[PDB]
């Protein structure tokens, strides 16, 4: 029998599915999420979230909560190699070199928060916004027809139930039920190496003393691996490899064998070790050839598995959720055509390919197997995560505008179409407001001081297309009043690419520039031009 319907069914309740639920619910889209596990993750995989992801958590309403939960990890500022935690230090450096001078580009910083503490924050936020989260519930099969998707659900309580949606968003991980049902092929290097993550309890306070590490590379004759200690210094995760080609297998990782390895990594006799969880995983590079299959969308690790060297995977998946959610909201609202959904593939798949390659390059670099060309190809994590340029029907390039790389120095992009609309602190009323805090719900049009023709065009297009558009003139200095944003520094038009006083920029709900005009329309047809821009972007 039926167990309901909703515009969107989300499969998977890890970071990408929970993020999808939050962003859809924030746009007022009713969704149901199914997660086979009885609750959120027991074994944390992700720990590091780059500043763009911090900006996306702020849009989600959970960044401040995450930063408060992470306050113990805030001191873990050093990456190190050691023989053991008790033993000799082999190298020591900063975890993210210039985390300290990001302030010109973003108000966020590197966030270190284990995944098992971030997921509950997203879960509680999704529930507050009205998402229907069904844990202990597995998607078994589905079928698409011209009007929707019918899913078969198993909550273990005997019999299966059907669910009917308009869209199915597969956030169901590297072995995606949905991707495999659809027989979507994946490209890339495939499986490179086999690993186990060993979550452990051990009192490390006497061994670490006052030292606090982000990540520790351990190398001694008994164990080679990565240790990440927790904020209370009473446990962590030891990540090791094994080689089936040498007769090693997962079966080898008994509790006793895991405790031996953790003890060897800690290096202090008499340290009592508790094994909390053993998480097997493969180091892999595999990207789906397409992320949109009619009414079925692939997001996160269902769409792309990247080598975890560089910590890009959850960052990339949360940005996928953020890209798709506003698009499904506008299609479900009847304000956009279904072509807008296809742009999820056009925009996120090339990022996924680039990011998967970056993970692979980091792995080559750390493995000492990197050619001089592969070394030169490694990008800054802020370039990978903040420097993206989209090409799709939801981006309208300037006539003179040139084709941008998939990712490049974010400091140079200066609000080009398809890139992140820059962070500028402006004034509204008596408050400071970030450009970033204007974005996340509606289209936003920001104009120069003399941009009233573009403002008028936004008011007209809003009525004509049934679309809310926030439109403001940005006025340099502090001599500004109601209906404007003040730009005390006079930085805004330069940071947005040298917009003239009559110029304008149109920002999508995801904070990506859709379109800009340096000045007035040459033909004085601002109203017709902005309407045509929005019709193209909205696939109508
Ligand atoms: C050791 C390690 C370290 C990492 N460190 C970082 C890091 O620091 N930063 C970072 O950004 N990323 C990191 N990553 C990557 C990150 O963990 C993943 O990219 C991320 O978890 C993917 O999220 P997801 O929601 O797409 O998939 P998953 O986390 O794989 O979750 C998928 C969910 O779907 C559920 N599911 C599957 N099939 C079904 C079904 N049929 N019905 C219902 N539910 C289903 C599963 O139970 C699971 O809970 C790391 C990964 C590893 C392995
Ligand atoms: O669920 C289990 O079987 C164990 C219990 C805890 O140690 C975490 N994992
Ligand atoms: O570096 C420690 C990894 C050992 C793997 C294990 O020995 C498989 O049998
Ligand atoms: O408890 C240590 C923090 C979590 C680390 C994570 O498990 C690494 O994948
Ligand atoms: O003099 C300070 C100006 C405040 C700006 C105004 O509130 C624009 O919205
Ligand atoms: Cl990763």
Residue numbers in the entry: 9 to 548
Show passages lifted from the paper.
Recently, two group A flavoprotein monooxygenases (FPMOs) (GrhO5 and GrhO6) and a flavoprotein oxidase (GrhO1) were shown to mediate the drastic remodeling of the 3 backbone and subsequent spiroketal pharmacophore formation. First, GrhO5 generates a ‐spiroketal moiety as part of the advanced intermediate dihydrolenticulone (4), which entails the rupture of three C−C bonds and a CO2 elimination step. The functional homolog RubL from rubromycin biosynthesis was shown to catalyze the same reaction sequence, pointing toward a universal strategy for spiroketal formation in the rubromycin family. In this work, the combined crystal structures of GrhO5 and RubL suggest three interconvertible catalytically relevant conformers, hereafter referred to as the “acceptor state” (FADox in OUT; accepts substrate, no reaction with NADPH), “reducible state” (FADox in OUT with bound substrate; reducible by NADPH) and the “catalytic state” (FADred in IN with bound substrate; reacts with O2 for hydroxylation).
Hence, crystallization screens under high‐salt concentrations were conducted, in which only RubL crystals formed in presence of shunt product 7 that diffracted to a resolution of 1.6 Å. Indeed, a Cl− was found coordinated between the C4a‐position of the FAD cofactor and the protein backbone including P316 (distance of 3.5–4 Å from the proline carbonyl to Cl−), which is conserved in the majority of group A FPMOs. Notably, although the active site was partially occupied, clear electron density for the shunt‐product was not observed. However, the FAD cofactor shifted and adopts the “IN”‐conformation, which is stabilized by several hydrogen‐bonds formed between the heteroatoms of the isoalloxazine ring and the protein backbone as well as amino acid side chains. Strikingly, several active site residues have a different rotameric state compared to native and 3‐soaked GrhO5 with F287 and W289 now stabilizing the FAD conformation by direct T‐shaped (W289 to FAD) and indirect (F287 to W289) π‐π interactions. At the same time, rotation of these amino acid side‐chains results in the opening of the NADPH‐entry site, which may be beneficial for the efficient release of NADP+. Notably, co‐crystallization of RubL with 7 apparently also caused a loop ordering (residues 90–110), which resulted in the closure of the substrate entry site and a more confined reaction chamber. Overall, these changes lead to the catalytic state of the enzyme. The observed Cl− adjacent to the FAD cofactor indicates this site, which is likely optimized to trap the transient superoxide long enough to allow spin inversion and collapse of the radicals to the FADC4aOOH (step IV). In this process, the backbone carbonyl group of the highly conserved proline of group A FPMOs (P316 in RubL) may function as an H‐bond acceptor to stabilize and position the FADC4aOOH intermediate to ensure regiospecific hydroxylation.
